[PDB]
UniProtKB/Swiss-Prot annotation:
Residues 1-165 form the Macro domain. Responsible for the cleavages located at the N-terminus of the replicase polyprotein. Participates together with nsp4 in the assembly of virally-induced cytoplasmic double-membrane vesicles necessary for viral replication. Antagonizes innate immune induction of type I interferon by blocking the phosphorylation, dimerization and subsequent nuclear translocation of host IRF3. Also prevents host NF-kappa-B signaling. In addition, PL-PRO possesses a deubiquitinating/deISGylating activity and processes both 'Lys-48'- and 'Lys-63'-linked polyubiquitin chains from cellular substrates. The chain holds residues 1027 to 1191 of 7096 of the full protein. This is Papain-like protease nsp3. It comes from Severe acute respiratory syndrome coronavirus 2. It is found in: Host endoplasmic reticulum membrane. May form homohexamers. Interacts with N protein. It is a multi-pass membrane protein. Signal peptide: none annotated. It catalyses: Thiol-dependent hydrolysis of ester, thioester, amide, peptide and isopeptide bonds formed by the C-terminal Gly of ubiquitin (a 76-residue protein attached to proteins as an intracellular targeting signal). It comes from the Viruses. Changing residue 29 to A: In strain: Mu/B.1.621.
């Protein structure tokens, strides 16, 4: 199962790791993708996860969007996990750099409650523009299921652990 995680709360764990390498190693039931409403996995965690699937995630995602239309900000969809996980839970956190509402971050984390265990990044962190400290606080106060957070940046991981309340 998951190794080397630091326990933050009863159900939230954190590790300084590349979520792609973590998914390839664990092959969890669910890997969370930091998705946008269009499932266009061009960069960030989405681009990295999609690149690890040899673009199979993008091909599947385009067929999903062609059939269903875009997701809502704060929403999600379950697609294949390809070579990374059984499933990929594509969750759309608000992108502050695209001027989206940061109040939707709690709704985005509520999607995690539909899965008993998940490997996930911090929603809306990184290129999505939100404060990762705020994202971790929303995560621990919203997610009740077992969430194993992978934080790519070592320096951010240390800041997140050292400032955790
Ligand atoms: C392999 N990982 C990445 O390329 C990666 C990791 C983290 C980010 S973030 N969420 O923007 O800080 C983007 C991309």
């Amino acid at each position: 199962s998951f190794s080397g995680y630091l326990k933050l709360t009863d159900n939230v764990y954190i590790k300084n790791a590349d979520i792609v390498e973590e998914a390839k190693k664990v092959k969890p039931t669910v890997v969370v993708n930091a998705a946008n409403v269009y499932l266009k996995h061009g960069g960030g965690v989405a681009g990295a996860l999609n690149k690890a699937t040899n673009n199979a995630m993008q091909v599947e995602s385009d067929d999903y969007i062609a059939t269903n239309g875009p997701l809502k900000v704060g929403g999600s969809c379950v697609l294949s996990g390809h070579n990374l996980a059984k499933h990929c839970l594509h969750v759309v956190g608000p992108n502050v750099n695209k001027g989206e509402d940061i109040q939707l971050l709690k709704s985005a984390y509520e999607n995690f409650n539909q899965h008993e265990v998940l490997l996930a990044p911090l929603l809306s962190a990184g290129i999505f523009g939100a404060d990762p400290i705020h994202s971790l606080r929303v995560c621990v106060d919203t997610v009740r299921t077992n969430v194993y957070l992978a934080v790519f940046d070592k320096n951010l991981y240390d800041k997140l652990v050292s400032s955790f309340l």
